[PDB]
Design a binder for this molecule. Structure first.
Ligand SMILES: N=C(N)NC(=O)c1nc(-c2cc3c(F)cccc3o2)c(N2CCCCCC2)nc1N
Length: 245
Protein backbone atom coordinates (compact mmCIF):
# COMPACT_ATOMS: atom_id res chain seq x y z
CA UNK A 1 0.00 0.00 0.00
CA UNK A 2 1.50 3.31 -1.17
CA UNK A 3 0.55 6.11 1.25
CA UNK A 4 -2.49 5.41 3.42
CA UNK A 5 -2.08 4.44 7.03
CA UNK A 6 -0.99 1.62 9.30
CA UNK A 7 -3.79 -0.47 10.73
CA UNK A 8 -4.40 -3.72 12.59
CA UNK A 9 -6.47 -6.80 11.86
CA UNK A 10 -9.45 -5.55 13.95
CA UNK A 11 -10.07 -2.95 11.19
CA UNK A 12 -10.12 -5.62 8.44
CA UNK A 13 -10.81 -8.94 10.29
CA UNK A 14 -11.56 -10.86 7.04
CA UNK A 15 -8.01 -10.18 5.79
CA UNK A 16 -6.05 -13.36 5.09
CA UNK A 17 -2.24 -13.44 4.92
CA UNK A 18 -0.99 -16.09 2.46
CA UNK A 19 2.58 -17.45 2.53
CA UNK A 20 4.45 -20.23 0.73
CA UNK A 21 6.92 -22.75 2.10
CA UNK A 22 10.12 -23.28 0.27
CA UNK A 23 12.43 -26.15 -0.22
CA UNK A 24 14.67 -25.94 2.78
CA UNK A 25 11.78 -24.71 4.85
CA UNK A 26 11.89 -20.94 4.55
CA UNK A 27 8.45 -19.25 4.43
CA UNK A 28 7.77 -16.04 2.50
CA UNK A 29 4.73 -13.84 1.98
CA UNK A 30 2.78 -14.37 -1.24
CA UNK A 31 -0.46 -12.39 -1.33
CA UNK A 32 -3.53 -11.21 0.57
CA UNK A 33 -7.00 -12.77 0.57
CA UNK A 34 -10.46 -12.33 2.12
CA UNK A 35 -12.39 -14.75 4.33
CA UNK A 36 -15.83 -15.17 2.74
CA UNK A 37 -16.94 -18.08 4.94
CA UNK A 38 -15.40 -20.10 7.77
CA UNK A 39 -13.68 -22.56 5.36
CA UNK A 40 -13.07 -20.32 2.29
CA UNK A 41 -10.62 -17.55 1.42
CA UNK A 42 -10.85 -15.71 -1.90
CA UNK A 43 -7.78 -14.25 -3.62
CA UNK A 44 -6.14 -13.78 -7.06
CA UNK A 45 -5.06 -16.66 -9.37
CA UNK A 46 -1.86 -14.81 -10.43
CA UNK A 47 -0.56 -15.25 -6.88
CA UNK A 48 -0.41 -19.04 -7.24
CA UNK A 49 -0.09 -19.80 -10.97
CA UNK A 50 3.71 -20.34 -10.90
CA UNK A 51 3.50 -22.72 -7.90
CA UNK A 52 0.01 -24.25 -8.18
CA UNK A 53 0.52 -26.93 -5.46
CA UNK A 54 -1.77 -26.47 -2.40
CA UNK A 55 0.71 -28.10 0.04
CA UNK A 56 3.19 -25.25 -0.56
CA UNK A 57 0.87 -22.67 1.11
CA UNK A 58 0.02 -21.42 4.59
CA UNK A 59 -2.88 -19.08 5.42
CA UNK A 60 -3.10 -16.93 8.55
CA UNK A 61 -6.21 -15.21 9.82
CA UNK A 62 -6.22 -12.66 12.65
CA UNK A 63 -2.69 -11.51 11.77
CA UNK A 64 -1.64 -7.82 11.88
CA UNK A 65 2.12 -8.26 11.26
CA UNK A 66 4.13 -9.89 8.48
CA UNK A 67 6.91 -11.85 10.22
CA UNK A 68 5.79 -11.91 13.85
CA UNK A 69 2.79 -13.63 15.39
CA UNK A 70 -0.32 -11.67 16.41
CA UNK A 71 -2.11 -12.73 19.58
CA UNK A 72 -5.23 -14.75 18.68
CA UNK A 73 -4.16 -15.55 15.09
CA UNK A 74 -5.04 -18.87 13.38
CA UNK A 75 -2.84 -20.82 10.95
CA UNK A 76 -4.27 -23.04 8.19
CA UNK A 77 -3.07 -25.43 5.51
CA UNK A 78 -4.74 -25.27 2.09
CA UNK A 79 -7.10 -28.22 1.66
CA UNK A 80 -8.15 -26.96 -1.78
CA UNK A 81 -6.54 -24.51 -4.24
CA UNK A 82 -9.04 -23.53 -6.96
CA UNK A 83 -7.70 -21.32 -9.76
CA UNK A 84 -9.98 -19.90 -12.46
CA UNK A 85 -9.94 -22.09 -15.62
CA UNK A 86 -10.22 -19.02 -17.85
CA UNK A 87 -7.32 -17.10 -16.36
CA UNK A 88 -4.89 -15.46 -18.69
CA UNK A 89 -2.20 -12.87 -18.55
CA UNK A 90 -1.17 -10.31 -21.11
CA UNK A 91 1.85 -8.04 -20.57
CA UNK A 92 -0.01 -6.10 -17.92
CA UNK A 93 -3.51 -7.27 -17.49
CA UNK A 94 -4.67 -10.45 -15.92
CA UNK A 95 -8.02 -11.83 -16.89
CA UNK A 96 -10.23 -13.74 -14.57
CA UNK A 97 -7.76 -13.14 -11.76
CA UNK A 98 -9.67 -14.95 -9.03
CA UNK A 99 -8.90 -17.95 -6.82
CA UNK A 100 -10.48 -19.84 -3.94
CA UNK A 101 -8.57 -21.46 -1.08
CA UNK A 102 -10.37 -23.94 1.19
CA UNK A 103 -8.64 -23.70 4.57
CA UNK A 104 -8.20 -26.46 7.11
CA UNK A 105 -6.12 -26.48 10.29
CA UNK A 106 -3.81 -29.28 11.34
CA UNK A 107 -6.66 -30.15 13.72
CA UNK A 108 -9.04 -30.10 10.77
CA UNK A 109 -10.94 -27.00 11.69
CA UNK A 110 -12.09 -24.05 9.57
CA UNK A 111 -12.08 -20.39 10.95
CA UNK A 112 -13.64 -19.68 14.37
CA UNK A 113 -14.89 -16.05 14.23
CA UNK A 114 -13.48 -13.75 16.92
CA UNK A 115 -12.68 -10.07 17.45
CA UNK A 116 -9.76 -10.42 14.98
CA UNK A 117 -11.40 -12.92 12.55
CA UNK A 118 -14.72 -12.24 10.71
CA UNK A 119 -16.19 -12.91 7.24
CA UNK A 120 -16.89 -10.24 4.61
CA UNK A 121 -20.12 -10.20 2.61
CA UNK A 122 -20.10 -10.76 -1.14
CA UNK A 123 -22.00 -8.24 -3.28
CA UNK A 124 -25.35 -8.99 -4.90
CA UNK A 125 -24.88 -9.76 -8.59
CA UNK A 126 -23.84 -7.02 -11.03
CA UNK A 127 -24.33 -4.46 -8.20
CA UNK A 128 -21.38 -2.12 -7.59
CA UNK A 129 -21.20 1.44 -6.22
CA UNK A 130 -21.27 4.37 -8.64
CA UNK A 131 -18.03 5.93 -9.88
CA UNK A 132 -16.42 8.32 -7.42
CA UNK A 133 -17.44 6.16 -4.42
CA UNK A 134 -14.62 5.90 -1.84
CA UNK A 135 -13.57 2.33 -1.03
CA UNK A 136 -10.79 0.88 1.11
CA UNK A 137 -7.88 -1.44 0.28
CA UNK A 138 -5.77 -3.44 2.74
CA UNK A 139 -2.45 -5.28 2.51
CA UNK A 140 1.18 -5.96 3.39
CA UNK A 141 2.42 -4.81 -0.06
CA UNK A 142 5.23 -2.34 -0.75
CA UNK A 143 5.04 1.20 0.66
CA UNK A 144 7.07 2.54 -2.26
CA UNK A 145 7.67 1.10 -5.74
CA UNK A 146 11.45 1.23 -5.15
CA UNK A 147 11.27 -0.62 -1.79
CA UNK A 148 13.05 -3.92 -1.39
CA UNK A 149 11.09 -4.89 1.75
CA UNK A 150 7.43 -5.30 2.53
CA UNK A 151 6.11 -3.42 5.58
CA UNK A 152 6.02 -5.41 8.79
CA UNK A 153 2.71 -3.80 9.88
CA UNK A 154 -0.58 -4.10 7.96
CA UNK A 155 -1.73 -1.03 6.00
CA UNK A 156 -4.88 0.37 4.43
CA UNK A 157 -5.90 3.32 2.30
CA UNK A 158 -8.87 4.80 0.48
CA UNK A 159 -9.30 4.96 -3.29
CA UNK A 160 -12.17 6.16 -5.47
CA UNK A 161 -13.87 3.95 -8.07
CA UNK A 162 -13.33 5.03 -11.68
CA UNK A 163 -15.82 4.45 -14.49
CA UNK A 164 -15.23 1.90 -17.10
CA UNK A 165 -15.40 4.56 -19.76
CA UNK A 166 -12.75 6.61 -18.04
CA UNK A 167 -10.46 3.62 -17.34
CA UNK A 168 -10.90 2.62 -21.02
CA UNK A 169 -9.10 5.81 -22.22
CA UNK A 170 -5.82 5.09 -24.05
CA UNK A 171 -4.09 7.48 -21.59
CA UNK A 172 -5.33 5.12 -18.87
CA UNK A 173 -5.44 1.41 -19.88
CA UNK A 174 -7.15 1.22 -23.31
CA UNK A 175 -8.75 -2.21 -23.81
CA UNK A 176 -6.60 -3.90 -21.13
CA UNK A 177 -9.55 -3.21 -18.77
CA UNK A 178 -12.74 -5.28 -19.26
CA UNK A 179 -16.20 -5.12 -17.67
CA UNK A 180 -15.06 -7.94 -15.33
CA UNK A 181 -12.49 -5.50 -13.85
CA UNK A 182 -12.88 -2.36 -11.71
CA UNK A 183 -10.50 0.61 -11.61
CA UNK A 184 -9.83 2.71 -8.52
CA UNK A 185 -7.40 5.49 -7.68
CA UNK A 186 -6.63 8.60 -5.69
CA UNK A 187 -7.55 11.94 -7.35
CA UNK A 188 -3.89 13.01 -6.69
CA UNK A 189 -2.47 9.54 -7.59
CA UNK A 190 -0.96 9.76 -4.06
CA UNK A 191 -2.05 6.38 -2.63
CA UNK A 192 -2.52 2.93 -4.22
CA UNK A 193 -2.11 -0.82 -4.07
CA UNK A 194 1.28 -2.25 -5.08
CA UNK A 195 3.32 -5.47 -5.33
CA UNK A 196 2.40 -7.71 -2.40
CA UNK A 197 -1.16 -6.30 -2.10
CA UNK A 198 -2.45 -8.69 -4.83
CA UNK A 199 -5.32 -10.93 -3.77
CA UNK A 200 -6.43 -8.54 -1.02
CA UNK A 201 -9.76 -6.79 -0.49
CA UNK A 202 -11.29 -3.72 -2.07
CA UNK A 203 -14.16 -3.07 0.35
CA UNK A 204 -17.06 -0.69 -0.26
CA UNK A 205 -20.13 0.20 1.79
CA UNK A 206 -23.13 -0.76 -0.26
CA UNK A 207 -26.61 -0.72 1.13
CA UNK A 208 -25.26 -0.18 4.59
CA UNK A 209 -23.11 -3.21 4.38
CA UNK A 210 -19.33 -3.68 4.06
CA UNK A 211 -18.99 -5.64 0.82
CA UNK A 212 -16.12 -7.35 -1.01
CA UNK A 213 -16.38 -5.30 -4.21
CA UNK A 214 -12.94 -6.12 -5.62
CA UNK A 215 -9.76 -8.16 -5.36
CA UNK A 216 -6.39 -6.43 -5.99
CA UNK A 217 -5.22 -7.69 -9.41
CA UNK A 218 -2.94 -5.40 -11.41
CA UNK A 219 -1.65 -1.94 -12.33
CA UNK A 220 1.14 -0.23 -14.25
CA UNK A 221 3.59 0.89 -11.61
CA UNK A 222 2.17 2.01 -8.30
CA UNK A 223 0.53 5.39 -7.55
CA UNK A 224 1.46 6.61 -11.06
CA UNK A 225 -0.49 9.37 -12.78
CA UNK A 226 -3.15 8.00 -15.19
CA UNK A 227 -2.51 4.39 -14.05
CA UNK A 228 -5.18 3.28 -11.57
CA UNK A 229 -5.22 0.08 -9.58
CA UNK A 230 -7.19 -2.68 -11.29
CA UNK A 231 -9.38 -5.07 -9.35
CA UNK A 232 -11.28 -8.24 -10.14
CA UNK A 233 -14.95 -7.24 -10.16
CA UNK A 234 -16.35 -9.70 -7.58
CA UNK A 235 -20.01 -8.97 -8.53
CA UNK A 236 -19.34 -10.56 -12.00
CA UNK A 237 -18.09 -13.91 -10.54
CA UNK A 238 -20.84 -14.97 -8.10
CA UNK A 239 -21.82 -18.12 -10.07
CA UNK A 240 -18.16 -19.20 -10.21
CA UNK A 241 -17.77 -18.54 -6.47
CA UNK A 242 -21.09 -20.20 -5.60
CA UNK A 243 -20.42 -23.26 -7.78
CA UNK A 244 -16.88 -23.79 -6.42
CA UNK A 245 -17.98 -23.36 -2.76
N1 LIG B 1 -2.36 -0.48 -8.14
C1 LIG B 1 -1.29 -0.53 -8.92
N2 LIG B 1 -0.88 0.56 -9.58
N3 LIG B 1 -0.61 -1.65 -9.07
C2 LIG B 1 -0.89 -2.85 -8.52
O1 LIG B 1 -1.98 -3.15 -8.06
C3 LIG B 1 0.20 -3.86 -8.60
N4 LIG B 1 1.42 -3.41 -8.94
C4 LIG B 1 2.46 -4.25 -9.09
C5 LIG B 1 3.71 -3.52 -9.36
C6 LIG B 1 4.16 -2.78 -10.45
C7 LIG B 1 5.47 -2.26 -10.10
C8 LIG B 1 6.44 -1.48 -10.73
F1 LIG B 1 6.22 -1.04 -11.98
C9 LIG B 1 7.62 -1.16 -10.05
C10 LIG B 1 7.84 -1.62 -8.75
C11 LIG B 1 6.87 -2.41 -8.12
C12 LIG B 1 5.71 -2.69 -8.82
O2 LIG B 1 4.69 -3.41 -8.40
C13 LIG B 1 2.33 -5.62 -8.86
N5 LIG B 1 3.35 -6.61 -8.99
C14 LIG B 1 3.10 -7.98 -8.52
C15 LIG B 1 2.33 -8.76 -9.59
C16 LIG B 1 2.89 -8.77 -11.02
C17 LIG B 1 4.35 -8.37 -11.19
C18 LIG B 1 4.53 -6.86 -11.08
C19 LIG B 1 4.66 -6.43 -9.63
N6 LIG B 1 1.07 -6.05 -8.54
C20 LIG B 1 0.01 -5.22 -8.41
N7 LIG B 1 -1.21 -5.71 -8.08
Amino acid sequence: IIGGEFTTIENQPWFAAIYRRHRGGSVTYVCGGSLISPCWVISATHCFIDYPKKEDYIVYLGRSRLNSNTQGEMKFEVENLILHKDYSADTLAHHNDIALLKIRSKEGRCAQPSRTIQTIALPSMYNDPQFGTSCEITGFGKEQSTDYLYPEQLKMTVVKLISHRECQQPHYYGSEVTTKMLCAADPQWKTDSCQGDSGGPLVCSLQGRMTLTGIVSWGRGCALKDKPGVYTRVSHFLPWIRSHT
